[PDB]
Write a protein that binds this DNA or RNA. Structure first.
Ligand code: MG
Ligand code: MG
Ligand code: MG
Ligand code: MG
Ligand code: MG
Ligand code: MG
Ligand code: MG
Ligand code: MG
Ligand code: MG
Ligand code: MG
Ligand code: MG
Ligand code: MG
Ligand code: MG
Ligand code: MG
Ligand code: MG
Ligand code: MG
Ligand code: ZN
Lengths: 71, 161, 177, 47, 50, 92
RNA sequence: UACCGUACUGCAAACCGACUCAGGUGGGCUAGUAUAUAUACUCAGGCCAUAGAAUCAACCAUGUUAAAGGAACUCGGCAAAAU
RNA sequence: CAUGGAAUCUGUGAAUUUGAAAUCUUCGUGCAGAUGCGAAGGCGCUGGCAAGGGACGAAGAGACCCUAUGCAGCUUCGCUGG
RNA sequence: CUGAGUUCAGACCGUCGUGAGACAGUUCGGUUUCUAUCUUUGUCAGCGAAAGGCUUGUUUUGAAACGCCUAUGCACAGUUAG
RNA sequence: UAAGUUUUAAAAGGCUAGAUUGCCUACAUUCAAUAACACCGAAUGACCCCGACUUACAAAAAGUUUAGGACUAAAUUUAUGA
């Protein structure tokens, strides 16, 4: 329950292999604003993106709907 | 090459120290050709916590190094982004190096000055809650060719019909 | 220690069950008051299942459904909205009244974050699909739905012309009693 | 602020039945001069 | 019974034990004060102030 | 505040002298009696505050209880207009 | 009709314990069901800041339930259950 | 089965210990129970999560015995003292 | 893991003793610390790159892919080791 | 899950390495943060997941269904008889 000797620099490096992080092999890049994120995640202005210019979504027309606004 | 001198001795000592390390950076490890670099001092993170992120950007090109820093939730990745952005700013606007060919050819973490504290173990024994610091040295070389981007760029969720 | 994910059941969300049901009732009330809320993935998935249950209960429109929703749904300003605007909006939709879009991680604890919103509304982020898809009577699906016992299930207006000949009658008004 | 220390005041009376009585001869009197207006000596001497 | 809290603060007892007047009341207290002076202590007693 | 408008301009030592005069056996411990009277004065100042808080809370309860029913009446009378509008346009 | 106290805290992150310490710290006031200052829910009032986020590890702590038996367990029905 | 640790991630962030280590098994030998010597054999390398047989694990230069020009307190028909 | 008995500190009974005390004589009561460094062991995982020459079997505008032996990878895997 | 239900021969049975043989349009992202659901699964020529409807002759795990998420395409179907 106690180290009997002092760990060497080589043994410490070998033991610390679990602590290292793996590199990610894919990234989703917005061509305008240069943002970077995963392909399954929104990274536009609604999420955190202060560089968003809205050019990330290139078409959004939806004028017609009809309903009862409850007031 | 600075025929002038400062007025106070402190400024003169600092300027001579700066020129000595600019000598040591040239004709040493690398040096030679024109290099954009940055030194981010006193990052409020441990050396192991920074070394967790620094092993990801070692040897990568600049855009996928920014990608590797921007794809993790770690606190150290924001400081690594700050250092890489400072090095990129020096390389592109202070120097005249071409972008999209910069490779992160040298990045390492050195020790900072610690702030010693105290932790209160049981049975009256003292402890520690030392606040660790570290420094970042980033050197961006310019390659002879634009390199392989190492991470495939895919379209986001926004780019959808 | 009971298996909830991997054996289709409700999430535990790090909470006791009475706290868990109360938090879901608060979130479904918030989801229909402001139609898009942002939260962690586990609460987002649990909210999506609970929203389908609550919206169908509002779609029944019965007195027992109102009584059950009166305890489930807190605001009362939005109990009216669930039984009137939401019920008329999704009157013909066979489930799936909510979509989930992941939005990265939050700063305080690096937890995954999802956007959860009601579909088919002005201000949604993806075009909806029609709940019904009128069939071609000259295709294979219609003949399979004639030989087998399936209804027509066509898209309809809120009041079709099949009630027009009853409501036009001046002897079927009763004067309003 | 801890032990009720008495400051450097001059006492003007004494308690007889718990009601303090200020003795009128111990009330403060200031012998100010007749006029300090258009008096020909100022606090400053010219250099 | 947890120990360590023997110091129960009280201004009356502090001044009545280690104050100037109990030090001056006895001869050996006066040599205690005299060797406090000979050492050079800035605070002579626990109740000194100005 | 929290006490009546007649609470100022009224010396409370009339109470002290009154209950010291008509009960001649309160003169045994006069200092204890005065301590009890001063304690009564602070306690009465607290009871005024408590009565004010309870009165304001009981007013606010029925005010919100009325306003909620007014809001539901407005919502139902807004829904009925829409429903009759739909059936009327089905008529036309 | 002077002089001193009057901020803030005071079962506590502000006092005594090296600590933002699960410990120790005196007196007083109080509404309903209701009936005792006990017990369950609640009034006035206060609080949900000092690690967060999901999930089915083993194992540990604390509990609920358990067929047929029932101290056969164990140094000792200790511990639980039971009245 | 329930609650809370433990296990995963993010953030804060100790200590006991430490001659240097790149520390295999068995048998023999040996300051007399060997990771380090001899003979034979085995072993891609490094870890996480677990169990603790070994490292005569760690934690006290006093558990017990003996010794001191050793101390200390106590006892008495030990000795001497007003 | 226990501490039931073999080390104490409290007390009683009996034996011996002038007494402080002794009893391996009977009794009642009397702190079991440790988060695993590496040696084993269970189990779950990561690392251990290649392309070699084709004089390319062919083509002109020894570089480019094509066709070969096996090199990795993957699958079934000795009448095949342990 | 056992207190329940099956099976426990000569050699049977398991684990690790593997001569060979065969094949190759294989950079490894998403469907929920602990795939152990799922690699003997799926990603729109998709019922993989989720929701909706029905079932007391399942006191509820199957059947229909692309409503929602695994994005995606046109000059003969916004698309499988999923
Ligand atoms: Mg558990
Ligand atoms: Mg409860
Ligand atoms: Mg006590
Ligand atoms: Mg002390
Ligand atoms: Mg307390
Ligand atoms: Mg302490
Ligand atoms: Mg405390
Ligand atoms: Mg309560
Ligand atoms: Mg909290
Ligand atoms: Mg029974
Ligand atoms: Mg837990
Ligand atoms: Mg040996
Ligand atoms: Mg292992
Ligand atoms: Mg371990
Ligand atoms: Mg001797
Ligand atoms: Mg869809
Ligand atoms: Zn953008």
């Amino acid at each position: 329950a106690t180290p009997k000797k002092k760990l060497s620099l080589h043994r410490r490096g070998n033991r610390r292999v679990w602590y290292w992080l793996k590199r990610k092999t894919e990234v989703a890049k917005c061509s305008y604003c240069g943002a970077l994120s995963g392909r399954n995640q929104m990274f536009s202005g609604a999420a955190g993106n202060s560089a968003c210019t809205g050019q990330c979504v290139e078409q959004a027309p939806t004028p017609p709907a009809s309903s009862y606004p409850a007031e | 090459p600075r025929n002038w001198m400062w007025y106070d001795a402190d400024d003169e000592r600092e300027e001579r120290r700066k020129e000595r390390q600019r000598l040591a950076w040239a004709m040493g490890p690398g040096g030679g050709e024109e290099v954009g670099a940055a030194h981010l001092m006193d990052v409020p993170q441990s050396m192991k916590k920074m070394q967790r992120i620094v092993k990801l950007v070692r040897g990568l090109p600049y855009p996928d190094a920014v990608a590797q820093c921007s794809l993790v939730p770690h606190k150290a990745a924001r400081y690594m982004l700050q250092a890489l952005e400072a090095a990129h700013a020096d390389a592109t606007e202070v120097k005249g190096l071409d972008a999209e060919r910069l490779v992160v050819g040298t990045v390492f973490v050195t020790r900072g000055a610690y702030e010693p504290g105290i932790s209160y173990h049981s049975k009256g024994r003292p402890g520690s809650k030392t606040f660790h610091r570290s420094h970042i040295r980033v050197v961006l070389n310019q390659a002879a060719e634009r390199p392989a981007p190492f991470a495939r760029i895919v379209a986001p969720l926004m780019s959808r019909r | 220690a009971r298996v909830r994910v991997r054996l289709g059941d409700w999430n535990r969300l790090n909470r006791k069950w009475q706290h868990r049901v109360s938090m879901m009732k608060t979130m479904v009330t918030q989801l229909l008051e402001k139609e898009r809320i942002r939260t962690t993935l586990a609460k987002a998935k649990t909210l999506q299942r609970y929203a389908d249950k609550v919206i169908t209960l509002g779609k029944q429109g019965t007195r027992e459904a109102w009584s059950e929703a009166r305890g489930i749904v807190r605001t009362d300003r939005e109990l009216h909205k669930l039984f009137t605007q939401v019920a008329l909006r999704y009157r013909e939709r066979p489930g799936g009244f909510t979509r989930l879009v992941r939005a990265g991680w939050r700063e305080r604890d690096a937890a995954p974050v999802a956007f959860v919103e009601l579909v088919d509304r002005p201000g949604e982020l993806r075009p909806a699909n029609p709940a019904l898809q009128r069939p071609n009577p000259l295709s294979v699906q219609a003949w399979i739905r004639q030989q087998l016992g399936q209804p027509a299930r066509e898209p309809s207006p809120l009041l079709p012309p099949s009630v027009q000949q009853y409501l036009r009658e001046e002897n079927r008004i009763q004067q309003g009693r | 602020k801890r032990v009720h220390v008495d400051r450097g005041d001059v006492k003007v009376g004494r308690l007889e039945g718990g009601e303090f009585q200020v003795l009128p001869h111990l009330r403060p009197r200031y012998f100010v001069p007749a006029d300090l207006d258009k008096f020909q000596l100022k606090p400053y001497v010219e250099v | 019974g947890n120990r360590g809290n023997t110091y129960q603060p009280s201004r009356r007892k502090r001044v009545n034990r280690h104050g100037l007047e109990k030090r001056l009341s006895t001869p050996q207290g006066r040599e205690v004060l005299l060797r406090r002076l000979r050492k050079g202590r800035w605070r002579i007693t626990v109740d000194s102030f100005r | 505040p929290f006490g009546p408008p007649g609470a100022e301009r009224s010396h409370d030592w009339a109470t002290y002298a009154r209950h010291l005069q008509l009960q001649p056996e309160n003169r045994r411990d006069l200092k204890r009696y005065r301590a009890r009277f001063v304690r009564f004065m602070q306690l009465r100042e607290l009871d005024w505050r408590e009565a004010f808080q309870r009165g304001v809370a009981e007013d606010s309860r029925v005010s919100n209880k009325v306003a909620r029913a007014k809001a539901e009446a407005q919502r139902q009378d807004a829904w009925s207009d829409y429903k009759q509008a739909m059936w009327q346009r089905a008529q036309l």
